[PDB]
Amino acid sequence: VDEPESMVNLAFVKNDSYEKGPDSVVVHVYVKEICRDTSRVLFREQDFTLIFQTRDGNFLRLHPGCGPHTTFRWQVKLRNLIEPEQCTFCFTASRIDICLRKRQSQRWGGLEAP
């Protein structure tokens, strides 16, 4: 767990996203059984990458050594840059809620009142 020497790209994600308010979008990703010591986030203007380790006995047992030496990342490039300065996070026991500010603005809301 000290030497990962591995970067795995994840193809399956467990989350749900929705846009809340005029300029805000808040999502919650289900990230559990994670070695928080190794759970890192690489974020920029509009995109972010989540790299971490977890424990899945069923999967890890199928490949001896996999798991504590396996570090993987999920990358999301969000469309319409966000303002990291205004961003906040929300931690539940098994899920991670995040409040994203869509400062690049969302277009077309239908009929708007002056």
Swiss-Prot record:
Reported function: Deubiquitinating enzyme that regulates the degradation of various proteins by removing ubiquitin moieties, thereby preventing their proteasomal degradation. Stabilizes RNF123, which promotes CDKN1B degradation and contributes to cell proliferation. Decreases the levels of ubiquitinated proteins during skeletal muscle formation and acts to repress myogenesis. Modulates transcription of major myofibrillar proteins. Also involved in turnover of endoplasmic-reticulum-associated degradation (ERAD) substrates.
Subunit record text: Interacts with RNF123. Interacts with BIRC2/c-IAP1, BIRC3/c-IAP2 and XIAP/BIRC4. Interacts with HIF1A (via N-terminus). Interacts (via N-terminus) with HSP90AA1; this interaction activates the deubiquitinase activity of USP19.
Subcellular location per the Swiss-Prot or TrEMBL entry: Endoplasmic reticulum membrane
UniProt note: domains: Contains two CS (CHORD and Sgt1) domains, namely CS1 and CS2, in its N-terminus and a catalytic USP domain (USPD).
Protein name: Ubiquitin carboxyl-terminal hydrolase 19
Organism the protein comes from: Homo sapiens (Human)
Similarity remark: Belongs to the peptidase C19 family.
All copies of domain CS, residue ranges: 10-112
